[PDB]
Design a protein around this ligand. Sequence first.
Ligand SMILES: O=C(O)C(=O)Cc1ccc(O)cc1
Ligand SMILES: [Fe+2]
Length: 210
Amino acid sequence: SEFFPVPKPIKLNPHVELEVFQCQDTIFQLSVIAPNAKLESHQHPESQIGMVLSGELELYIKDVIKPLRALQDIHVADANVSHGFVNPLSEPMIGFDLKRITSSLPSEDVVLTLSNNQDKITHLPCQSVKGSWFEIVMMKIPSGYSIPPHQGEQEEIGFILNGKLEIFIENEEQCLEYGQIYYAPSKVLKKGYNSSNQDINLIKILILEH
Ligand SMILES: O=C(O)C(=O)Cc1ccc(O)cc1
Ligand SMILES: [Fe+2]
């Protein structure tokens, strides 16, 4: 559905497998990059951001090489900026990316790092960073916690890394596990509930432009 999109599985080359989700004008993908993969640099008109979830990655961008750490660093490739990658480990890299034709002014950094903060709506501790066209928030949803009803001005895409989370968007409800996402367009009512006995790690991306 629009709010709980079904991914399309793609194999991009012998090294890269993707689960591709459409979120109106944003594409969200979960990636699996093979052990020791070299990914040739490419460019495209879509701006791109992403993070490693498991493993490690090296970003090749603007004639420098930047390491990317799991659940910490976000790579940022503005429109038509040439970017490539190496997986420096003999383990697969599991990650995600978002791609979107952006209107915003250029990003000042090719790598951003999450830092400790507080989630506005819930007042729960989180780690976050804000970029030129996006904000990424990672946070633990405690066992039993109810994410209160909220209508955001900004589009939001989210997913979890472990456990099972109940998510309601506008007029539709699903239990989410890792491998699925939710998409909440601007102004839709969203709420959620961790009915499991474990703390759930949630990542959300707010799209700052329309
Ligand atoms: O999917 C994208 O746009 C990426 O940026 C990941 C990527 C980069 C370079 C390649 O040669 C293949 C895949
Ligand atoms: Fe790319």
